[PDB]
Amino acid sequence: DGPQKQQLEMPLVLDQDLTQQMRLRVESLKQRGEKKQDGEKLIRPAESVYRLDFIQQQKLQFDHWNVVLDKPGKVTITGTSQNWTPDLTNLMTRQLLDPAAIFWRKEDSDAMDWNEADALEFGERLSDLAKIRKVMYFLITFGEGVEPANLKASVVFNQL
Ligand SMILES: C[As](C)(=O)[O-]
Ligand SMILES: C[As](C)(=O)[O-]
Ligand SMILES: C[As](C)(=O)[O-]
Ligand SMILES: [Zn+2]
Ligand SMILES: [Zn+2]
Ligand SMILES: [Zn+2]
Ligand SMILES: [Zn+2]
Ligand SMILES: [Zn+2]
Ligand SMILES: [Zn+2]
Ligand SMILES: [Zn+2]
Ligand SMILES: [Zn+2]
Ligand SMILES: [Zn+2]
Ligand SMILES: [Zn+2]
Ligand SMILES: [Zn+2]
Ligand SMILES: [Zn+2]
Ligand SMILES: [Zn+2]
Numbered sequence: 001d002g003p004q005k006q007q008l009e010m011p012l013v014l015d016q017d018l019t020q021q022m023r024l025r026v027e028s029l030k031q032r033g034e035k036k037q038d039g040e041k042l043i044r045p046a047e048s049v050y051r052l053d054f055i056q057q058q059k060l061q062f063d064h065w066n067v068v069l070d071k072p073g074k075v076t077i078t079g080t081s082q083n084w085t086p087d088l089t090n091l092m093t094r095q096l097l098d099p100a101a102i103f104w105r106k107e108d109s110d111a112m113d114w115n116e117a118d119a120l121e122f123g124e125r126l127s128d129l130a131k132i133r134k135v136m137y138f139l140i141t142f143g144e145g146v147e148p149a150n151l152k153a154s155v156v157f158n159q160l
Contacts, residue, residue, distance in 0.1 A: 006159040007063055012050040012138055014148050018086050019049040041093040048148055052136035061158035062127045065119060067103045068112055073146030074104040078139045079122060082132035126155060
């Protein structure tokens with residue numbers, strides 16, 4: 001908009017503990033032979049839980065994503081209802097957001113690509129979801145050839 005605005009880049013960091021929580025849960029149901037909680041969303045092996053901590057709940061405007069990969073691959077960052085307390089609820093399929101920001105990189109080059117229109121729609125939303133709580137949770141789906149160790153995934157906001 002304007003080349004003048006202060007920007008704050010906030011990293012989506014790997015949430016190893018809850019990722020595992022979720023990983024053990026899908027087990028459990030296996031060893032127990034119990035079914036899920038009706039509309040419960042079970043973390044697949046290909047997904048990993050990421051965390052985003054909002055440094056300034058207010059005055060965040062969202063500006064652009066800053067996601068890049070090490071190898072050619074694909075990733076999908078599906079947001080999560082800010083009403084989901086991983087301390088309390090079990091993530092419900094319905095708690096996932098629409099849409100998701102899908103990013104990918106093709107073989108020969110280094111240039112990142114994504115689903116623009118959607119990555120922007122989902123984006124403009126973080127500026128408000130920030131005012132709900134200082135913690136945002138996401139579920140990243142890794143393609144083939146990609147694993148957590150190839151990704152940088154911060155979100156750049158504008159300071160109002
Ligand atoms: C300067 As802008 C269009 O990335 O909010
Ligand atoms: C889901 As937790 C163990 O980071 O409060
Ligand atoms: C071809 As696929 C949708 O199983 O990564
Ligand atoms: Zn944690
Ligand atoms: Zn679960
Ligand atoms: Zn902007
Ligand atoms: Zn592909
Ligand atoms: Zn917790
Ligand atoms: Zn849609
Ligand atoms: Zn494109
Ligand atoms: Zn779409
Ligand atoms: Zn818009
Ligand atoms: Zn819109
Ligand atoms: Zn896959
Ligand atoms: Zn695939
Ligand atoms: Zn393929």
